[PDB]
């Protein structure tokens, strides 16, 4: 309750140079369903397992992408109306100066 | 009030401004310090009565 | 200020009630501001 939601972070089997239609539609659906998810502060962090490394990239959803995701219903890899103008890259960096923590379900596990 | 003034002399009162959490305190602010002193003195007086 | 005054329990609890009312008022105000910002984003994207 003292922190403001900032989005979600998810893994990727291999690096890609763009935000996927699946990720954008999921983000838009979550934002539409939940009012607390402001579209200007939330982001998507993609961790891609590149050869012997993890590459992290941050993406932000523009209003056009928000509308397209909230309206879309196709879960295929190449839905209609998805354009590179729907998302933009936001600056993200690491830090050794403070520590964050985790929160897992009570009765069960996560996976 | 004179009880609180009397407490303002004890070494305890000095440490309730540098190490408050030791004494169940939640802040070095004047409000917090006065409230804790009042609670402690009231509790002791009630028990004595 | 410097000298710590004594406060009765009734006064202390009244002050605590006033403080909690203040913070809930400020929470409602911030929620309304968030609603305004969300409307601005929605009608900018719309």
Multimerization state: part of a larger assembly
| Number of helical segments with 4 or more residues of chain C | 1
Strand order of the largest sheet of chain A: 1-2-3-4
How much of the sequence lies in strands of chain C comes to under 5%
Strand content of chain A: 15-25%
Number of strands of chain A: 4
**Most extensive chain-chain interface:** A-C, 10 and 9 residues
PDB class: splicing
Keywords: exon-defined spliceosome, late pre-B state, RNA splicing, splicing
Entry title: Cryo-EM structure of human exon-defined spliceosome in the late pre-B state.
Chain A: Pre-mRNA-processing-splicing factor 8
Describe the structure.
- The structure is cut from a larger assembly and holds chains A (111 residues), B (49 residues) and C (46 residues).
- Chain A has helices spanning 21-33, 63-71; strands at residues 7-12, 43-50, 53-61, 87-89.
- With 111 residues, chain A is α+β, with helices and mostly antiparallel strands.
- Chain A is globular, with a radius of gyration of 15 Å.
- Chain B is globular and about 30 Å long.
- Chain B is an all-alpha fold.
- In chain B, 8% of the residues are buried.
- The A-C interface holds A 35-36, 38-40, 62-64, 66-67 and C 34-35, 37-38, 41-42, 44-46.
List the helices and strands and how they pair.
The structure is cut from a larger assembly and holds chains A (111 residues), B (49 residues) and C (46 residues).
Chain A: E1 7-12, H1 21-33, E2 43-50, E3 53-61, H2 63-71, E4 87-89
Parallel strand pairs in A: 1-2
Antiparallel strand pairs in A: 2-3, 3-4
Chain B: H1 2-7, H2 11-15, H3 30-48
Chain C: H1 9-45
Tags for this entry?
part of a larger assembly, 3 chains, A: 111 residues, alpha+beta, 4-stranded mixed sheet, 2 helices, B: mainly alpha, 61% helix, splicing, exon-defined spliceosome, late pre-B state, RNA splicing
Q: How would you briefly describe this protein structure?
A:
This is part of a larger assembly, with chains A (111 residues), B (49 residues) and C (46 residues). With 111 residues, chain A is an alpha+beta fold.
């Amino acid at each position: 309750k003292e922190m403001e939601p900032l989005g979600w972070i998810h893994t990727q089997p291999n690096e890609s140079p763009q935000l996927s239609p699946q990720d954008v539609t999921t983000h838009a659906k979550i934002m539409a369903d939940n009012p607390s998810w402001d579209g200007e502060k939330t982001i998507i962090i993609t961790c891609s397992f590149t050869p012997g490394s993890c590459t992290l990239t941050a993406y932000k959803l523009t209003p056009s992408g928000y509308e397209w995701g909230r309206q879309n219903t196709d879960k295929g890899n190449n839905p209609k109306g998805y354009l590179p103008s729907h998302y933009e890259r936001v600056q993200m960096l690491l830090s050794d100066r403070f520590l964050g923590f985790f929160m897992v379900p009570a009765q069960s596990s996560w996976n | 009030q004179d009880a609180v003034d009397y407490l303002t002399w004890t070494f305890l009162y000095r440490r309730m401004t540098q190490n408050p959490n030791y004494y169940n305190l939640q802040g070095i602010s004047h409000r917090h310090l006065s409230d804790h002193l009042s609670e402690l003195v009231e509790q002791t007086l009630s028990d004595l009565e | 200020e410097a000298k710590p005054k004594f406060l009765s329990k009734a006064e202390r609890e009244a002050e605590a009630l006033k403080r909690r009312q203040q913070e809930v008022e400020e929470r409602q105000r911030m929620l309304e501001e968030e609603r305004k910002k969300r409307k601005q984003f929605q009608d900018l994207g719309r």
